[PDB]
């Protein structure tokens, strides 16, 4: 265990590289990536048709990927959506350089 | 109906005989009603559905057997290779390429690949 690897893992989780890692892990279990893309698209279409009002700020495709990751034993936030606890107040948005 | 009013669950053999009789006569809808009655009674309906489609094929009711097989495949049930071959061969001999191709697609989805026999049967109509 390296002692000074807290901020790196924190930034990896916050930025969204978890999505890339999960995509690579889910493509390492598929022969043809095009059929995987079509399957994910169909599942996201079913999710959208089931609950329209649920989405709009939460992505159905990210929700499908998070469900597939959670069903594989790896804990992932629902649709990879996280909120900033250190937000100053309403109407204040962070500036990502 | 008397046995059911008696409060006793009917045996699987009774429902099998009823399904066979309905398939021999050609009453596919009553056969499906019996299958649903077996399903709500927690009985397994795979063997009864196979006997039903086989009797419907034998009773010359090809389209009824085809739609019953399609309903069973949509339900999630599986079929034996002999049922696949019989359905495909009869549909190709009659001239119905659409149902034959649909049954072939359902078979390949179920895990069983197609051999030269099914392709020759399909080409018999395609030519």
């Amino acid at each position: 265990r390296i002692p000074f690897l807290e901020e790196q893992v924190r930034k990896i989780r916050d930025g969204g590289k978890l999505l890339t890692m999960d995509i690579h892990r889910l493509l390492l279990n598929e022969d043809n990536r095009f059929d995987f893309v079509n399957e994910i698209a169909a599942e996201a279409k079913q999710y959208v048709e089931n609950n329209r009002d649920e989405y709009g700020a939460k992505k159905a495709i990210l929700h499908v990927l998070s469900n597939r990751m959670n069903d594989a034993g790896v804990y992932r936030a629902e649709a990879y959506m996280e909120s900033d606890p250190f937000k100053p107040g309403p109407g204040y948005m962070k500036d990502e350089l | 109906r008397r046995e059911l009013s008696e409060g006793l669950r009917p045996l699987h053999e009774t429902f099998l005989a009823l399904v066979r009789l309905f398939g021999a006569k050609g009453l596919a809808t009553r056969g499906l009603e019996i299958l649903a009655a077996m399903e709500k009674l927690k009985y397994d309906i795979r063997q009864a559905w196979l006997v039903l489609v086989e009797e419907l094929v034998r009773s010359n009711h090809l389209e009824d057997a085809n739609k019953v097989f399609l309903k069973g495949a949509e339900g999630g049930l599986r079929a034996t290779d002999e049922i696949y071959d019989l359905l495909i061969e009869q549909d190709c001999k009659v001239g119905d390429h659409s149902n034959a191709l649909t049954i072939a697609y359902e078979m390949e989805a179920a895990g069983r690949m197609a051999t030269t026999f099914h392709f020759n049967c399909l080409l018999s109509v395609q030519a």
Partner: protein, 43 residues
């Protein structure tokens, strides 16, 4: 592994005057035939 068969065939050829007439000919409720252009006027 039966493939998903998609069959689309575009076709081109010389058209008879009957077809180029039927592309324009229409029968109004009164019974006249419209489609013929006979005057150079545009507007």
């Amino acid at each position: 592994m039966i493939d998903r068969y998609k069959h689309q065939q575009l076709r081109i050829g010389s058209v008879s005057p009957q077809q180029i007439s039927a592309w324009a000919t229409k029968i109004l409720p009164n019974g006249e035939i419209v489609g013929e252009v006979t005057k150079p006027y545009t507007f």
